[PDB]
Each structure stands twice: as structure tokens, then as C-alpha cells.
Amino acid sequence: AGPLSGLRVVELAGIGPGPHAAMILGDLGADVVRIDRPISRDAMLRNRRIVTADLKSDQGLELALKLIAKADVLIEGYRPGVTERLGLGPEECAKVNDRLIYARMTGWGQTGPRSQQAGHDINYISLNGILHAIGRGDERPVPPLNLVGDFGGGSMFLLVGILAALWERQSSGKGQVVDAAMVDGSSVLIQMMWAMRATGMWTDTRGANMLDGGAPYYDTYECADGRYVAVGAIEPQFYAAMLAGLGLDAAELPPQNDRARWPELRALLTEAFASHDRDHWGAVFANSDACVTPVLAFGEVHNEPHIIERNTFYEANGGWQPMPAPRFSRTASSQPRPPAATIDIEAVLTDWDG
Amino acid sequence: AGPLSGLRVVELAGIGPGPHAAMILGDLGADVVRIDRPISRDAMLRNRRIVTADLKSDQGLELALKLIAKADVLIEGYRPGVTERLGLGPEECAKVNDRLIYARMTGWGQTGPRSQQAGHDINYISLNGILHAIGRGDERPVPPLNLVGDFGGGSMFLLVGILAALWERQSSGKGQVVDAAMVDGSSVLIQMMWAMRATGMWTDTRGANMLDGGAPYYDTYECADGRYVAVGAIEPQFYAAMLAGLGLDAAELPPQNDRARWPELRALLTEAFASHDRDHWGAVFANSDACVTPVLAFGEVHNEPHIIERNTFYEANGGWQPMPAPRFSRTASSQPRPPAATIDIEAVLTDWDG
């Protein structure tokens, strides 16, 4: 019963960013109908009704269009031109529903020399400087999973575009097309580095900056047990709290920001964190402003008190899944409805009156 | 002149996710007024009017509330309780404007055992399993910059919450509080891995999965010149195209998905990519679906045809910055207005009719 209660969304089944956007809409209360090819164990397909249609057939196109005629939002993540050839392109949908927000989720965008080329997250962040910046400096770049292209710079930007176009519709009375390209959204996601590059505050050298692992006060450390803590003590007063927790005398260490001595500083902090296990540090720093936290593996997360107490996760079935985010004080989101059986497309049409 | 034209936003000056959310609002056309302490070279502060006020004073609090009274959205990123203590808490704002979307940007959230504790991006993603999953398997975890907590799982969720709450207000006539905690938003951002963990499609072992650098067909490779390409050839037909371009005979290699022979497969791909420079592979794979792209450093991004042709960046006096995302067919966003001089707060009030 979240803030998107009442919003009608038609989702053309796809992979990665599209269904993630659709999931978040459903999480927040939207009525999302996913059209798939003629019960899922994919938790991402929570908060849906699933219908089936052959979009290449006359019948399937007609039904999809009747559904779209009644919706607020359409999500598609095919190659540019695919919906157009199916008879489901923006100009065709406009004929039946000029209030539709037509949301197009791609990596390279609707136009441009790479627009028809296959790719995945790693390719989109390769082209815009992001991938080059991730990883240790003495090694080739490492992919930050598909967190940055598919999701942070992908579905998240599709969602901002959908909801912004809905705001616009309040006064125009009309929808329009949202072109969310991972290559664009991930670039805005990393705008802080573009800003910092311009003022000398960030360099193109991998692994040699404040927030990429280059700084001894912003990195992970291996403990006695081979598990890790994360140190994020940027501000001097947090850095000071970190040293106090370690029992180190600041007068005997290199200054926090003397980069010429960062290897020496890191060596001293490495020795300190290596002297006890991760959970020892977890306890020492549990309540302080030192910005030191245990690095938990997925399987351990459900046992952490802050995670438990805030209900960041729920138990779906044979696994934890994240509860909806963000949170709303008045129209709070429900626990997600699990994936259910395929339902009849005509039953949905009856429900929506189309 | 983007879709958010007419939306009024008050930003209480902060660091990281708050200003990034405010930026994207302004990018898309919102009228964003940022209250600072009594010309910026920070490109993130594009698309604002900056005013100045001492929030701890009687005059400053009164002026802030007058502005807030006329706004749609307020963004604050302080420790929970700080705005309350200042007289700017949600209950105080409700008295002057019960249409206000009160957006609270934090790492740990408004409540819970860590709610008053300092932290940065690395700490939030340490506690929820994300950081553990990033990096090579034989090394300690590496921070994916602050892309995942501060932005992907942070400002992006604040934005979804703001715009979703605005949709809700169309029917209710009222605002509410958005509690965007990076610990929550980043967990939803990584929901695909929680889904996959439940069905045996992802493991807690770092560097040993399909999308974390574990798979030879989803990783970077060093070329002859010490620069890199990204390979994302997941689908068999894209994988085949990749091998074709490398001139490798598929019948002589281990099968793509025989994980027992992944080290053998990677060694063969490593030798192949090492035999020529990055530029060469760009030419070999330029118009193919091999999912092989050059890994560009920030400084080279502006020279890439796909980047140029789509105007993903614009030049600010000094350096490149990302254009607004996503894109809108009918109400297109303008090129961002650079940071400007501070203006009289009473000028803004007069403009807004406060």
C-alpha cells in the first residue's frame, strides 16, 4: 500500500535493468502487469501479475495494445527498433494512449553508432571511464558486479525518468518517451568524479585516490581470521577515533593525509588490524564514530543487529530478500507479494476495463 | 525546460548523496534553492540558486521556514535529530506546509542501533554483503568508489522516493517523510544477487561468479600496450563472435561454461588479447556483437564516437561533465547552468511569493 498505489504499469518481459525497475514500481504499490512469452523462483519477479501473449501474432498484439491503452507506464528493454517492428513502438502506442510514459531501457541508447550493438553492463561502463577507475592499481580493472550500469546508472535512471514524466503529465495531460541509456545514467551517477577531476581532486590513476582504495583510511583490511573490516574514517575526528580504538599513538604515525607516507601508514594499520579477528574489531568499533565496520558476506547479513532491527530484509522462501526502499512515513510499502502463477490476460483487461 | 519544470526544491547544503539528488532534480528542470552557511568550482552544484542563512539563528530559521512554506520538496542529509533540534524537523515543517515532501538522506536510516553513528559509503556496503562481493578472489575487497552506497543505493533512491511521493500527493493532497537509507537502497540495488543466491545462481565466494570477474567471458583483459578491453560475451552467439574475432577455433578451446576448465580458457583468451594493443581490438570488434569494448580512461572518453555523437557530455569551463539523464522526447532537459554567485534570499522569497 505504498505511494505508487494506483499506477498501472505494463512490463514487456526482459532481463536485468527493465525488470528491476518494474520490481521497484511494484514494491512501492504500483499495479504491474508483466507480459511474457507463451510459478517463477526469481524473487525479482515479486509484486507482479504475469500474463502471456505472442507479440508476433495478431491476437497477441491486439491484447497487448488493449492493455497498454489502460496503463500509465510501459517498460521495454529490447534493442531499438524491436517494438517498432512488433507494432508496439511509441507512435503506435500514442494512437491508443497519449498519456502513456513509454520507458525505453537500453545500454547504448536509442540512437548512435553503437545503438544496435549487443552488450552488457561491463561494456557500458567500459566506454565512459567508470570501469577503468575500479580495482587495485597494480592490476586490471575489476567489474563492480553489474551494480553501476544495469542498476545504479540503469533501472534507477529509468525510474527517475518514469516518475518525472508522470509529474510533467500533471500539467501537460500527456506522456512522452523516456530514453534511459546505461552509458548516460552511469555517467551522471559518477558526476562527482567528473566534478573532482576538473579541480585536481581526482586522477585517472586507478587505485590512487581518496575513495578507490588508494587512501589507508578508506579501504578494507584483513584481520587475524582472514575476514575483513572496512575503514571509512575521512574526517580527522573519525580518523582520530579509529586510531584510539586501535590503541595507536598518532604522534608515532605518519599524518593522515601525507600521501608520500601512505604506504607506511597503511603498513602500520595493516599490522594493527591483523592482530585480532574481524569480530573483535566489530565489537571495539560497534558504537563509535571511527567509521570501522565488519565486512559481512551475504550469508551473515541477517544476523547483524542494525539489519535485523530495521527490517532491511524479509524471508521469502529459502532466502532473504531486501524489503522495499526508500521508506515512506504515511503510505508505507507492504512486504512484497511473492511471484505467483500466470493469470489470464482477459481477466486483467476486465480488471482495468479495457 | 525538462519534465520537472515548476517543481520547487529546498536543499540544506550537505555532502555526497544529498547534493547529487538535488543536482538531478535541477538537471531535469526543477527550481532548486540550496541554503548554505553564511562562485563554486564544484560542478555538482550546477542548476541551483544558492542562498545563505544561519539556521541556528532566529532570523535564519524564520527565513528558511518561509522558503520551505513555498516548496514542494525539502532535502536534508544530516544525522537524524539535527533538523528537529534546529526547528526544521518534519513536524515543524508540516505546520507551515503539509504538502511538503520531506526527504531525509542518510546511510543507516532514521532509526536503529546505528542511526546516530558516523559512516561513509564503504561502511554501509560493508554491513549488507555488497562490499564482500567486490574484487578479485585472492585479495581483500575493493571499494567500487562511492558509486553503490552514496549514489546507486543512495541519492537514486532518495529521488525515486521524492517523485513517488509527488505521485501520491496528486490523490492525497499531502506530502510525507521519505527515509532513504543507503543501507536499504543499496540492498534493493543488489536484489538480483539476493534472488540468484536463493536459486544457486550466485555464491558468497568473491571473484568466482558470472558477473564479478570470475568468468573468463565477463572480465577485463590486458592488451599488448598495457591498456584493457572489457569482454561481456555471455550469450553463446556473442561468445562465438568474440572467439571469431580473436581468430581462435572454438573446437580447440574448453566449452564456455565448463567452469572446471575456466583457468585454461582464461589463459587462452589472455594470450590472445595480449598479442595486440587495445586500439586493434576496437577495430577488430567495432560493429560486432562480440561484446568487446575498449576500457577508456576518463580523459579519453570525449574522443569516443558513440559518446560524442550522443552528447553524453558537455564542456564546462575547464573539463567535461555529464549531460542530464535519462532523456525525454517532448520536454527535453537543458544543458546544465553552471554554479553562479550567491543571491539575496529575499529575492528568492519574492520570486516564490513567500
Curated annotation (Swiss-Prot), chains A, B:
Give the top-level enzyme category.
Answer: isomerase
Example GO molecular function: alpha-methylacyl-CoA racemase activity
Give one GO biological process term. Answer: lipid metabolic process
Matching entries from SUPFAM superfamilies are given as:
CoA-transferase family III (CaiB/BaiF)
EC code? 5.1.99.4
Reported uses of this protein in biotechnology and industry: Development of gem-disubstituted substrate-product analogs as inhibitors of racemases and epimerases is elaborated using alpha-methylacyl-CoA racemase from Mycobacterium tuberculosis as a model enzyme. These non-physiologic substrates could be used as a therapeutic agent to inhibit human AMACR, which is overexpressed in prostate cancer.
Q: How is its activity regulated?
A: Inactivated by N,N-dialkylcarbamoyl-CoA substrate-product analogs.
- Summarize where substrate binds, as residue positions: 37, 53-56, 77-79, 85, 119-124
The protein's annotated catalytic reaction(s) are: a (2S)-2-methylacyl-CoA = a (2R)-2-methylacyl-CoA; (2S)-2-methyltetradecanoyl-CoA = (2R)-2-methyltetradecanoyl-CoA; (2R)-pristanoyl-CoA = (2S)-pristanoyl-CoA; (25S)-3-oxocholest-4-en-26-oyl-CoA = (25R)-3-oxocholest-4-en-26-oyl-CoA
Impact when changing I50P: 28.8% of wild-type activity
* Lineage: superkingdom: Bacteria
Identify which residues the record assigns to the active site.
Answer: H120, D150
Give the protein's function: Catalyzes the epimerization of (2R)- and (2S)-methylacyl-coenzyme A (CoA) thioesters. Accepts as substrates a wide range of alpha-methylacyl-CoAs, including (2R)-2-methylmyristoyl-CoA and (2S)-2-methylmyristoyl-CoA, (2R)-pristanoyl-CoA and (2S)-pristanoyl-CoA, and the cholesterol esters (25R)-3-oxo-cholest-4-en-26-oyl-CoA and (25S)-3-oxo-cholest-4-en-26-oyl-CoA. Can also catalyze the interconversion of the non-physiologic substrates (2R)-ibuprofenoyl-CoA and (2S)-ibuprofenoyl-CoA, which are potential competitive inhibitors of the enzyme.
**Further information:** Interconversion is achieved via a planar enolate intermediate.
Question: What protein family does this chain belong to?
Answer: Belongs to the CoA-transferase III family.
Q: How does it assemble?
A: Homodimer.
Q: What is this protein called?
A: Alpha-methylacyl-CoA racemase
From which source organism is this entry? Mycobacterium tuberculosis (strain ATCC 25618 / H37Rv)
What would be the name of the gene that encodes this protein?
A: mcr
